[PDB]
Amino acid sequence: SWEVGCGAPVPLVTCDEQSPYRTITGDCNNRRSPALGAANRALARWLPAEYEDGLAVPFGWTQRKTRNGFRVPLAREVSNKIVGYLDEEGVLDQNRSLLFMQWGQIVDHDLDFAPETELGSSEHSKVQCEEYCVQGDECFPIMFPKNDPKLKTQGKCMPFFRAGFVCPTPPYQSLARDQINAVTSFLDASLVYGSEPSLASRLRNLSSPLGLMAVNQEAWDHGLAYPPFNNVKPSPCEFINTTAHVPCFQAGDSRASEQILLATVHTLLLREHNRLARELKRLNPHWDGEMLYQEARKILGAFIQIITFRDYLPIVLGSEMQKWIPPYQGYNNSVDPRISNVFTFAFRFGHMEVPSTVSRLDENYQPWGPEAELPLHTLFFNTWRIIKDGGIDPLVRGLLAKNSKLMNQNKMVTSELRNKLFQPTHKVHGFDLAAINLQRCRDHGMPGYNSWRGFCGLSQPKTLKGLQAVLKNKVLAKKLLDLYKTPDNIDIWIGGNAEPMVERGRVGPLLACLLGRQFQQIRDGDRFWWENPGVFTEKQRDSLQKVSFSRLICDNTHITKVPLHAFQANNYPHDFVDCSAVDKLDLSPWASREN
Ligand code: HEM
Ligand SMILES: *[C@@H]1O[C@H](CO)[C@@H](O[C@@H]2O[C@H](CO)[C@@H](O[C@H]3O[C@H](CO)[C@@H](O)[C@H](O)[C@@H]3O)[C@H](O)[C@H]2NC(C)=O)[C@H](O)[C@H]1NC(C)=O
Ligand SMILES: *[C@@H]1O[C@H](CO)[C@@H](O[C@@H]2O[C@H](CO)[C@@H](O[C@H]3O[C@H](CO)[C@@H](O)[C@H](O)[C@@H]3O)[C@H](O)[C@H]2NC(C)=O)[C@H](O)[C@H]1NC(C)=O
Ligand SMILES: *[C@@H]1O[C@H](CO)[C@@H](O[C@@H]2O[C@H](CO)[C@@H](O[C@H]3O[C@H](CO)[C@@H](O)[C@H](O)[C@@H]3O)[C@H](O)[C@H]2NC(C)=O)[C@H](O)[C@H]1NC(C)=O
Ligand SMILES: *[C@@H]1O[C@H](CO)[C@@H](O[C@@H]2O[C@H](CO)[C@@H](O)[C@H](O)[C@H]2NC(C)=O)[C@H](O)[C@H]1NC(C)=O
Ligand SMILES: [C-]#N
Ligand SMILES: [Ca+2]
């Protein structure tokens, strides 16, 4: 091999080994191999990387180089031809609420983040990439094709910087290049608490022995808290409304404010921790602050794993669920819990589930005000519509009463994301998420569609006729091959998402396999999985089975009408009940007695 002991982790940590609590970084989960699943380590490779020069140069970089004999097509062209559509009508998912899309994003943020590069405390190429579209070093621009309207209006490209990678931060030369996962691989609410000790400690309220998370001191939502403001300037959230001067929120994860509905769920989660910590202080007046924090935290981790595995996964994977995720049989220390590189692209099926608008509803679940429904592109990095325009309740009702967008082979990704995305570093609402997904697959050394079809034990299309049969669509198959010139070159993201959906699910066979095996691994390779004997007591697990997202809303908002099954499509008011009908989480089992 090339080094088995390489890298730039968090330095000096040692395992307690008989401690009830997860570490913040994820170290010490696996006794035998402590760094497994820890944050700031390389994403795992389930298959060897594919680079133009075998090591680090992505396909698409050199113009004369081919992949299997052909030029790879430009990400934006694939975007323009396959991914865009104009008419938003009829695209809604008739049996999935907007919360279905939004939870996907929460789970994702808990599992994987692959940061971009700097080594530019002040850079000037950071401007050579934007201003001039010059490829080079970590600038890998998305060039516009001939006849792209953004040419007329935007320039020659969209800037794009390669993903950070292990060992160093420098150009290098050891093993093939591996990207970093800056968060913990375990579903452990790292998105609320942080994945590094410094951020984790900054998010806490250490001014009092109550094990609380710090809340914003400038704004309140009917007596309920908001996260802290991230008071580092310049702020993306301030930039979108020079006048409101409302900054981004501070959470355990830096993307928290990417969009308003994401900021919203982060807020409920923060609020739930504090609720939990208060409740455990009435029950155990003798507990110190550290114990309150850790105990509340452990519960919150179990809520996220439960909602995810009991309510969310079954409706993404449908009939494939049991094929890839059998009933839990206990912790297996031989299982690799790392998130794989390919999963961070497979989990992006979610991009096709985002609708063009977001609504605010009032207490009768009717349009809230004259500007109730808003285009998604104005909600990127937008915290001012929250703080200054209703708080989170009207947003929360929207999440329950509105639908997600349905993946559709003819209508993939809304123009709100495909033409009008806002990137926190630049200043235009003019980027293309789809094109970015394609560029990123290449950046990350992904194998092609057929390599993954094979990995998953599925047939590999060698012909147009074969691709037609697999996609079950003549027209999609043909545009795809007019661009790629062989199924082997199709980027995993577009190939995976082009497959028709398995029965009672929302992803096709390939994605169901990639998703499925990954989820099986993080549950079975987790020493702190909630069902593993010894983590919780039996009585404690009997209480946890009764959690729901609907209850989380009742305890942390002023929404008083919710559905019993929040992920499916719900109509008001037939499918909405009063909060009193929804099970509460009983904490008596956490009552500790002295003698
Ligand atoms: C704005 C964005 C969203 C909502 C309006 C959104 C939504 C989702 C859903 C619902 C996901 C899963 C079900 C999901 C997964 C992942 N995303 Fe995506 N997303 C928005 C915007 C972005 C941006 C920008 C990125 C970074 C793109 C890049 O490559 O530079 C992004 C990424 C991801 C991602 C990979 C994360 C990682 O491992 O680094 C998902 C698993 N999303 N999003
Ligand atoms: C909207 O989606 C719903 C969930 O995807 C779906 O109903 C679900 O159907 C599944 C089986 O396909 C059932 O799962 C479990 O529920 C029963 C309760 O009667 C249990 O006893 C069984 O163990 C069973 O496995 C549920 O009945 C149901 N899921 C939930 C949690 O509600 C609807 O059919 C969809 N609506 C439409 C119009 O298709
Ligand atoms: C860390 O936790 C501290 C303890 O809860 C907390 O202090 C509490 O702060 C709130 C307001 O910030 C106070 O609530 C009071 O608000 C009005 C002022 O307009 C008063 O008139 C009322 O008495 C009301 O109680 C709490 O009194 C205060 N509690 C204590 C015991 O000091 C901090 O705010 C938390 N720090 C962070 C950064 O979140
Ligand atoms: C930047 O954010 C501003 C809010 O912080 C926002 O201005 C605010 O929004 C509207 C104006 O469009 C006003 O709402 C209503 O207020 C009173 C009564 O409540 C009405 O009489 C007004 O007619 C209006 O409908 C807010 O008062 C207003 N606040 C201020 C101080 O202007 C801007 O719209 C945001 N700008 C952009 C470009 O996003
Ligand atoms: C823990 O999971 C591991 C790894 O998947 C299992 O160990 C073996 O895995 C290989 C690879 O598929 C296969 O040979 C078998 O599935 C397993 N070996 C045999 C012959 O037992 C293992 O089943 C799990 N450990 C426990 C105790 O369940
Ligand atoms: C999406 N992040
Ligand atoms: Ca995590």
Strand partners, 340: 44
Q: What are phi and psi of 523, to 5 degrees?
A: -80, -50
Q: Which residues are annotated as a binding site?
A: 108, 110, 184, 186, 188, 190, 258, 351
Experiment used for this model: X-ray
Structure's resolution in angstroms: 2.4
Distance set, CA 333 to CA 180, 199, 522 (Å): 23, 29, 11
Task: Answer whether 330 contacts ligand 5 (Cβ < 6 A).
Answer: no
Give which of 355, 310, 352 is closest to 328, Cα–Cα.
Answer: 310
Strand partners, 221: 224
The rounded Å distance from CA 365 to ligand 5 centre is 51
Sketch the domain layout of the chain as residue ranges. 1-595
CA pair distance 84, 418, nearest whole angstrom = 7
Question: 1-595 has which CATH code?
Answer: 1.10.640.10
Q: Which residues of 284-318 are buried (b: 16+ CB within 10 A; e: fewer)?
A: beebebebbbbbbbbbbbbbbbbbbbebbbbbbbb
Q: Which residues are annotated as a binding site for Ca(2+)?
A: 110, 184, 186, 188, 190
Q: Which residue has the tokens 């937008």?
A: 382
CA pair distance 105, 257, nearest whole angstrom = 12
Cα-only R_g, the chain: 24
Residue 357: strand, helix, or coil: strand
> Using an 8 Å Cβ cutoff, are 567 and 396 in contact?
no
Strand partners, 491: 448
Residue 236: strand, helix, or coil: helix
Task: Answer whether 241 contacts ligand 4 (Cβ < 6 A).
Answer: yes
Task: Answer whether 575 contacts ligand 2 (Cβ < 6 A).
Answer: no
Q: What are phi and psi of 452, to 5 degrees?
A: -75, -35
The rounded Å distance from CA 210 to ligand 4 centre is 38
CA pair distance 93, 100, nearest whole angstrom = 10
Q: What angle do CA 95, 498, 512 make, to 5 degrees?
A: 65
- Ligand lying closest to the C-alpha of residue 333: 5
Q: What is the DSSP letter of 81?
A: I
Which residues are designated catalytic? 109
Task: Answer whether 95 contacts ligand 2 (Cβ < 6 A).
Answer: yes
Can you list the positions of beta strands (E) in 197-301? 204-205, 212-213
Q: Which amino acid is at 208?
A: S
- Ligand lying closest to the C-alpha of residue 328: 5
The length of the chain, given as a count of residues: 595
Q: Which residues are annotated as a binding site for heme b?
A: 108, 258, 351
Packing angle, helices 98-111 and 289-306, rounded to 10 = 130
Residues whose CB falls within 8 Å of the CB of residue 504, separated by 6 or more in sequence, listed in order: 315, 318, 319
Q: Which residue has the tokens 């049996």?
A: 95
Give which of 444, 268, 248 is closest to 348, Cα–Cα.
Answer: 444
CA pair distance 271, 277, nearest whole angstrom = 10
Residue 415: strand, helix, or coil: helix
